[PDB]
Amino acid sequence: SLEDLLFYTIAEGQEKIPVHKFITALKSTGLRTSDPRLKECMDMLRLTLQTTGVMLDKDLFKKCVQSNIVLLTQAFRRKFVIPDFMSFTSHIDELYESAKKQSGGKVADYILAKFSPDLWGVSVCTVDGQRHSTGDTKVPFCLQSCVKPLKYAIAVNDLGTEYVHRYVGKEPSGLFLNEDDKPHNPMVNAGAIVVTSLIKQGVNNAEKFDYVMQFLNKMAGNEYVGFSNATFQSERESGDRNFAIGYYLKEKKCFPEGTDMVGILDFYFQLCSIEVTCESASVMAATLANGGFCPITGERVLSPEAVRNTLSLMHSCGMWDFSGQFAFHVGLPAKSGVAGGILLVVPNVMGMMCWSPPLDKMGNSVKGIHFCHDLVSLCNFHNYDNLRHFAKKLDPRREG
Amino acid sequence: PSLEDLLFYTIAEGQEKIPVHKFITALKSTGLRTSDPRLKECMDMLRLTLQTTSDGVMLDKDLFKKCVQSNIVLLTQAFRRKFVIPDFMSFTSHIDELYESAKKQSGGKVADYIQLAKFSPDLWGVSVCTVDGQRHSTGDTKVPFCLQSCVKPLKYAIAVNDLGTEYVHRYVGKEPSLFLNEDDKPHNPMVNAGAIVVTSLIKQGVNNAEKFDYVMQFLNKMAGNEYVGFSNATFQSERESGDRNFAIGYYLKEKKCFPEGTDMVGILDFYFQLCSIEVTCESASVMAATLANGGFCPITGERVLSPEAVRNTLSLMHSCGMWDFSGQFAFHVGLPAKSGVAGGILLVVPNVMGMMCWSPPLDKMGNSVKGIHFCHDLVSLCNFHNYDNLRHFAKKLDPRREG
Amino acid sequence: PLEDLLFYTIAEGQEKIPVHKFITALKSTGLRTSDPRLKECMDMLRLTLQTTDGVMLDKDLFKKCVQSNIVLLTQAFRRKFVIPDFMSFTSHIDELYESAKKQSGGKVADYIAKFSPDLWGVSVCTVDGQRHSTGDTKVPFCLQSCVKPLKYAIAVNDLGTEYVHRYVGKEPSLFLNEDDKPHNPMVNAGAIVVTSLIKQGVNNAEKFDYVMQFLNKMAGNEYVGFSNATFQSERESGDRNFAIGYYLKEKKCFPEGTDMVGILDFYFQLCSIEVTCESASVMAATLANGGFCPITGERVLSPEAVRNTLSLMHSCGMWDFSGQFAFHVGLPAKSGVAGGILLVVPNVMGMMCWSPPLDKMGNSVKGIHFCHDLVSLCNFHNYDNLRHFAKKLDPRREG
Amino acid sequence: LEDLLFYTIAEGQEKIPVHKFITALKSTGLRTSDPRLKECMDMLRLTVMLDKDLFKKCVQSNIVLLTQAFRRKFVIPDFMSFTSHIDELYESAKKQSGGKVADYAKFSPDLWGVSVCTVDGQRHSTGDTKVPFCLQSCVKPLKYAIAVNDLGTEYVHRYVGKEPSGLFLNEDDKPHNPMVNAGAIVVTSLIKQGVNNAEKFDYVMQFLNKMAGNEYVGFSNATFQSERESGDRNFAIGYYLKEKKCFPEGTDMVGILDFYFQLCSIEVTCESASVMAATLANGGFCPITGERVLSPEAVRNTLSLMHSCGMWDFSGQFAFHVGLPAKSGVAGGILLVVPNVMGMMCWSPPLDKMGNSVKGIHFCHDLVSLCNFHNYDNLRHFAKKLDPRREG
Ligand SMILES: NC(=O)CC[C@H](N)C(=O)O
Ligand SMILES: NC(=O)CC[C@H](N)C(=O)O
Numbered sequence A: 001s002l003e004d005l006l007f008y009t010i011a012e013g014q015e016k017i018p019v020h021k022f023i024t025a026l027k028s029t030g031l032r033t034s035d036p037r038l039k040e041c042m043d044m045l046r047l048t049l050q051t052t053g054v055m056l057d058k059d060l061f062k063k064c065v066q067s068n069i070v071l072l073t074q075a076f077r078r079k080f081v082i083p084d085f086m087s088f089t090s091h092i093d094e095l096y097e098s099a100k101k102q103s104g105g106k107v108a109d110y111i112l113a114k115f116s117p118d119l120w121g122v123s124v125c126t127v128d129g130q131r132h133s134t135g136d137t138k139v140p141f142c143l144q145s146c147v148k149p150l151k152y153a154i155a156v157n158d159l160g161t162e163y164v165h166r167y168v169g170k171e172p173s174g175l176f177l178n179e180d181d182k183p184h185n186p187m188v189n190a191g192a193i194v195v196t197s198l199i200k201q202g203v204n205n206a207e208k209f210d211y212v213m214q215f216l217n218k219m220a221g222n223e224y225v226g227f228s229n230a231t232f233q234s235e236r237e238s239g240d241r242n243f244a245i246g247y248y249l250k251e252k253k254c255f256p257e258g259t260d261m262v263g264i265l266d267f268y269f270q271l272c273s274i275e276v277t278c279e280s281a282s283v284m285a286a287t288l289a290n291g292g293f294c295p296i297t298g299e300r301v302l303s304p305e306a307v308r309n310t311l312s313l314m315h316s317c318g319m320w321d322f323s324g325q326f327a328f329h330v331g332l333p334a335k336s337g338v339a340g341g342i343l344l345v346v347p348n349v350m351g352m353m354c355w356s357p358p359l360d361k362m363g364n365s366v367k368g369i370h371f372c373h374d375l376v377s378l379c380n381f382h383n384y385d386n387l388r389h390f391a392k393k394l395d396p397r398r399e400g
Numbered sequence B: 001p002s003l004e005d006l007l008f009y010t011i012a013e014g015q016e017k018i019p020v021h022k023f024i025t026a027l028k029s030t031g032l033r034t035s036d037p038r039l040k041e042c043m044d045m046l047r048l049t050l051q052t053t054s055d056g057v058m059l060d061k062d063l064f065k066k067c068v069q070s071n072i073v074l075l076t077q078a079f080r081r082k083f084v085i086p087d088f089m090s091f092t093s094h095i096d097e098l099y100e101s102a103k104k105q106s107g108g109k110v111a112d113y114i115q116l117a118k119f120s121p122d123l124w125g126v127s128v129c130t131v132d133g134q135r136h137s138t139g140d141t142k143v144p145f146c147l148q149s150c151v152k153p154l155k156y157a158i159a160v161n162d163l164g165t166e167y168v169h170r171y172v173g174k175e176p177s178l179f180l181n182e183d184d185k186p187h188n189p190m191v192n193a194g195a196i197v198v199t200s201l202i203k204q205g206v207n208n209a210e211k212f213d214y215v216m217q218f219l220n221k222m223a224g225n226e227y228v229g230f231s232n233a234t235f236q237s238e239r240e241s242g243d244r245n246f247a248i249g250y251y252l253k254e255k256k257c258f259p260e261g262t263d264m265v266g267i268l269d270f271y272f273q274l275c276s277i278e279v280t281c282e283s284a285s286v287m288a289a290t291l292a293n294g295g296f297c298p299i300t301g302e303r304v305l306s307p308e309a310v311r312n313t314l315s316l317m318h319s320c321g322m323w324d325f326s327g328q329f330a331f332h333v334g335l336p337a338k339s340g341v342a343g344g345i346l347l348v349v350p351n352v353m354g355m356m357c358w359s360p361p362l363d364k365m366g367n368s369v370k371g372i373h374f375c376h377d378l379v380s381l382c383n384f385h386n387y388d389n390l391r392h393f394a395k396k397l398d399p400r401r402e403g
Numbered sequence C: 001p002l003e004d005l006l007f008y009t010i011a012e013g014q015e016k017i018p019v020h021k022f023i024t025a026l027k028s029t030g031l032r033t034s035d036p037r038l039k040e041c042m043d044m045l046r047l048t049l050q051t052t053d054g055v056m057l058d059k060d061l062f063k064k065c066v067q068s069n070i071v072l073l074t075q076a077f078r079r080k081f082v083i084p085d086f087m088s089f090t091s092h093i094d095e096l097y098e099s100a101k102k103q104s105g106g107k108v109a110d111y112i113a114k115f116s117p118d119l120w121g122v123s124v125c126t127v128d129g130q131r132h133s134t135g136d137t138k139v140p141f142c143l144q145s146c147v148k149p150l151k152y153a154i155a156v157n158d159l160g161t162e163y164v165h166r167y168v169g170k171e172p173s174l175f176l177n178e179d180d181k182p183h184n185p186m187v188n189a190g191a192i193v194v195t196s197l198i199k200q201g202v203n204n205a206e207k208f209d210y211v212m213q214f215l216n217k218m219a220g221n222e223y224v225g226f227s228n229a230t231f232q233s234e235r236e237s238g239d240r241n242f243a244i245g246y247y248l249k250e251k252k253c254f255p256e257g258t259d260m261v262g263i264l265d266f267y268f269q270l271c272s273i274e275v276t277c278e279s280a281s282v283m284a285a286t287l288a289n290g291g292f293c294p295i296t297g298e299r300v301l302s303p304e305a306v307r308n309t310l311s312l313m314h315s316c317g318m319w320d321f322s323g324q325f326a327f328h329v330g331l332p333a334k335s336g337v338a339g340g341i342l343l344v345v346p347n348v349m350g351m352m353c354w355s356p357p358l359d360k361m362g363n364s365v366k367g368i369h370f371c372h373d374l375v376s377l378c379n380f381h382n383y384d385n386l387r388h389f390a391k392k393l394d395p396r397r398e399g
Numbered sequence D: 001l002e003d004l005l006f007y008t009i010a011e012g013q014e015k016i017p018v019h020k021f022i023t024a025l026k027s028t029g030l031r032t033s034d035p036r037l038k039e040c041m042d043m044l045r046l047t048v049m050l051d052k053d054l055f056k057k058c059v060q061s062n063i064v065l066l067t068q069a070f071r072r073k074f075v076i077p078d079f080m081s082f083t084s085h086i087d088e089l090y091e092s093a094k095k096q097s098g099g100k101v102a103d104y105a106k107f108s109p110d111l112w113g114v115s116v117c118t119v120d121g122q123r124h125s126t127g128d129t130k131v132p133f134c135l136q137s138c139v140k141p142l143k144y145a146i147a148v149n150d151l152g153t154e155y156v157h158r159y160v161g162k163e164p165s166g167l168f169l170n171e172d173d174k175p176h177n178p179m180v181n182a183g184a185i186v187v188t189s190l191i192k193q194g195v196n197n198a199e200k201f202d203y204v205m206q207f208l209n210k211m212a213g214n215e216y217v218g219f220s221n222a223t224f225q226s227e228r229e230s231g232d233r234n235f236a237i238g239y240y241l242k243e244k245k246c247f248p249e250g251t252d253m254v255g256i257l258d259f260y261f262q263l264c265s266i267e268v269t270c271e272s273a274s275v276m277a278a279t280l281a282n283g284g285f286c287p288i289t290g291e292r293v294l295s296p297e298a299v300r301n302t303l304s305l306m307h308s309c310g311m312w313d314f315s316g317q318f319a320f321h322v323g324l325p326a327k328s329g330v331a332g333g334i335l336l337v338v339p340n341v342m343g344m345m346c347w348s349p350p351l352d353k354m355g356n357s358v359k360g361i362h363f364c365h366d367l368v369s370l371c372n373f374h375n376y377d378n379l380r381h382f383a384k385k386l387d388p389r390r391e392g
């Protein structure tokens, strides 16, 4: 049987399995024992760890693993999207140390976004739940403009493409507005403000904010999502260009009717002050990598149409004035924000979040931007890499 | 436990003898064509044994072994449904449905400037070549027409393949759009000004006759030696009427955009020539598949282009390939593509297949009405969009799967 | 061998002149007996008409009244004013008025400003004080964007050219030019910045009072008012202007210590200042007269402020029509959305045309037609030649 | 009338020595070579002391122009005083040595000349006023004026715009104005159609001859050949206009470009060009011959477009600060018109970064800071500016 042919894969003709030897075997998969998809099995494990280490014969094991048996077998039969995760991890680690020596860039100074220039984190979450982090991946920071795809996805998920693009375009710019008196795309302030004005119309901005927070919670598999009121208050006083954009959008009747523009700006600053870590945000990115299903809970969070549209606009409009150079050389949908995050999606493989506060002169984190170039020079993750003929690039999706 | 031995019983149901037509029908249902260059030796020994045994058109397990030995590895992938699209017969009928549904779209004007860009507005063909060589066509797939601007990616690929990314893009940019960008470089190689500069990098220091022959040899390899020709009628008329291309040529000279030692008027003559190269949908679809297949021609197995050239060329087609429709196209279709004024759309679905749709009537942006309609429908049906998910794709069909 | 050497010019042999025959002769010059430069002489003339009846002036009853103003009166009667045959010129103004009166296109401004499309007036004030009006010339209307030159003139007069132009550019027209300065003071972003330089370190009530007292000097104290109705509606409908105000703040365009939202309220206020065509024509004549109000003789603006204001009106005055207008008309001009067109003919006269229905560029249909006709008739174009001008009339001439 | 100029010139003295009439004449600003004085200097070359019948025998034919001169009725009455101010202005710009000669014929950076011709024929020069140089883009007004004189405003402006640039073409696929290369090439293709370009060239030369009072107008084949070899941008503009169907039907674009290079290589001096500019200053009448050369509509349209489009990217700053119609050329000339007063030509080859002569541009700023010649100076209240049109 299934649990019986996973007991001998782990027990090497060796009668009973110590608990530490199943847990390391599991963690070697890249899964984390805190995975929400393994709770009942770790529940049954801290349950029988109270009948005091401990060692499991073939029926105590089966009593623990049957409830999660298929997820555990895909894990141990090297059937996950990256079969040799431990080797992949060391490459990610090599990449991390190589970006750490890049000291260019100036921390964002206009608010409050003066962190230390030494912070640098990278987190990975594959579409199968495999996790790895290195550096400062548990330090909270605000999403800033990396929330623009997340809220655009929510708007399309709830209302559909054709309604959303009555109000915002789908192409890069160079004006705020294009020739249809629509903002160019939802990845820029003029576009994201309009998108902010379509989410949950007909409810106050406090209930609106709760809905987006519940939505982001699903997207992160309930990992860390918070709010920084210091950044919200300080975004509010420094948002002169955003008020200019707000009034211009109102004068050009860009919003759906019944909108209170000044309130939408307040809501918009709020969404920009939402806090994440690199671990929690990399999971948000993996939901986008995984067709709308959160990879560590298995629930459908976004329509496949929402995810596709968002991945498309991140590809073409995601990195400010660097997005064309970025699309050419990196070939991955990505979104940078001014706190220094780069939300990065490798479709069908993984999502990631790099964070280092020092920005370059187009507003992208120097260390994150360096990491993304290096990552695609190593692995055939570029969108128009070939999955079969890829020269001397490494491919983490196949065996030895 | 022999390879030729257990492809014999896969095909021999009961029986120890396989009629030859029972092998040929099975072969073609995989989508391979008996003319495939990768099967030539086995097709030769099959017609030879039709000359050396008086009918009794039947293959025992050592007559089978004598014929398929040459190509047994390609043949088992075919018969073990290991090609990128295993149920090709079902997929083709979907292609056919899409063909017929675009056939009812009669908009658009045939190109008026010339010298027979005055084709019939009723010609409409689509050809498919997967990365494993499986082929299907429907409609007018054997009528010659000029590549026009569907040569811009191919020659950029040749230039990058010979010279590298970094040299080529000293001279042309890598982004969508006054002709020149902030660096007095053309915006990208998919627009006339960029393609004129790229044309001026291929095979420098050689006269325009070998320059042409060199590019012609290259397209032949990219097309697995299917039809690649040249229309001197179209060249002569592109030359007389290319007032704007001459304006671009001089502007590029004045802004020193060309390489040292370039003869501008000759480069423009070369440029019109490359625009008058002829294909069909079958031969061009194979060119598209070479780009879909990382640089290896899928029906010959030869490496034609570096994987760096193919990636660069696919990226710019994605962003700059469909004139002013390229953002809408990139959003809704999500595929690398290139339109030309003769009415072709070279189309690449990375890792699966290449296609060439051809219908002469263009819409107001210069794209074939029926081709553009065909491409929306295709991605509405199949999860080929660049950012479709290979695991969660709603009601979309996936031709890469079974059942 | 002076007051009595103008008495014989008016007295036909006769050594006694009836007052109405002096009044008729006076008004034929185009002067108004209400002219502030004639007040004393009209005072001593009504006093004499009180203290005696023989309504007749002997050679010192005349001399007792015109003594005060003898220099202006001799220039008037010796036909030394810029347009000597004013009665004939007037007759031409009337002809042009009637020909524009038959142009009924255009839509009135749709954001109350819903006036009548019937109103149509033109008033003329030469640089010597000669006046003429025809049509609806005493109806109040808001200056709207015809205040942009007047306030720029005030700012340069008080602060100088090179200070003001640290803050606003000087050339025709995305809101900001190549140097993160608005393009010129004749457009909203430029006018908002200019508004933020007038009378700094003062609350918006003295700022408004200061400009109103200034406009009064430019108008020789004819009607200058304020419409709170238009101000409230300018305040409610100014979404685009609120957008411009913030963009200017973000690109650090105001002078330090500016309250941007307050400046916008001042800006809406200045757009709601009210004039007639008569009072405004005098405002225009002040710019036409090198900075001196023509009906009081007072210096209102420095000649440098007037030049800069006239130079920018030429190039930036009529919204997107300013290139065609500068070609075909060649006169400094400024249109407003209430339907006025402030028009200056340098060295000759100022004018104010008013008709609310605007064409698609925001200019009064009738005013624009009047201005083309005027320059086809007279050699007032900036680059008409004063000696060889084909079939054009020259009103500065005694033909 | 002739007898009342005889006593005006003599102290009552006897008769008038001729050298003492010539000095009196030259002090008005008139030049004795003036074509309007041919007959009177003819009658003097026939004849050392003049009583009222030798005087009247010579001045009878020109007595009205001579009394206007001697009764101080010319546009600048105290010309000798004005002249010294021009000299001061010239000397003050002479010390501005920035700028680079155009490197696509290298003249000397030492040359610097200014010549003046009022609308009444009064002339003054300083510096290198007789050294020939090519007009380059200072022919664009002159070539536009000829076209409008012959064809009318509405025909010329089916083909060219009338507003500054800010694409070669505007919203109507017409070039922006005739003061830029794309506009001047179109203007060149309207002059004297239906005649080959050699006769076309002869005609513009005859036209420029009238505009200059038959002073020096020439042609430099060196500049023509070098314009031809260096004109890649002009060849690019030519083809773009052909594709966008901007020329009148029956145009041979490549030939028009050859004509266009020719017109830019026409040679003038500052003296002859100042007369050309004075013709524009004087409503189309040449001031040293009195003939109607251009329609008043052609001249007005030309002055309007020089004002707004004349000084390359400097035309907006220039129109504000100087307020005079002007056109600069890359050989270093600035054709400058003061409507109703005078025409001028400054020439100094070293150009600034916008393509305008450093010394000429300095002179034009200084000239308007000194005199109330700016378009929107007031003729009555002008602060401490000088007015050469008045007596004190
Ligand atoms: N790129 C960013 O993160 C900018 C966000 C910033 N709060 C804004 O809206 O202007
Ligand atoms: N766009 C096409 O398909 C061809 C373009 C055309 N041959 C040109 O060079 O202008």
Ligand SMILES: NC(=O)CC[C@H](N)C(=O)O
Pocket (backbone or CB within 6 Å): C143, C144, C145, C146, C188, C234, C241, C271, C335, C336, C337, C338, C362
């Ligand atoms: N009069 C006009 O042309 C516009 C005036 C108006 N108050 C504004 O600022 O927009």
Ligand SMILES: NC(=O)CC[C@H](N)C(=O)O
Pocket (backbone or CB within 6 Å): D135, D136, D137, D138, D181, D227, D234, D264, D328, D329, D330, D355
């Ligand atoms: N700049 C000029 O005035 C003349 C030179 C110009 N490049 C031309 O010959 O067309």
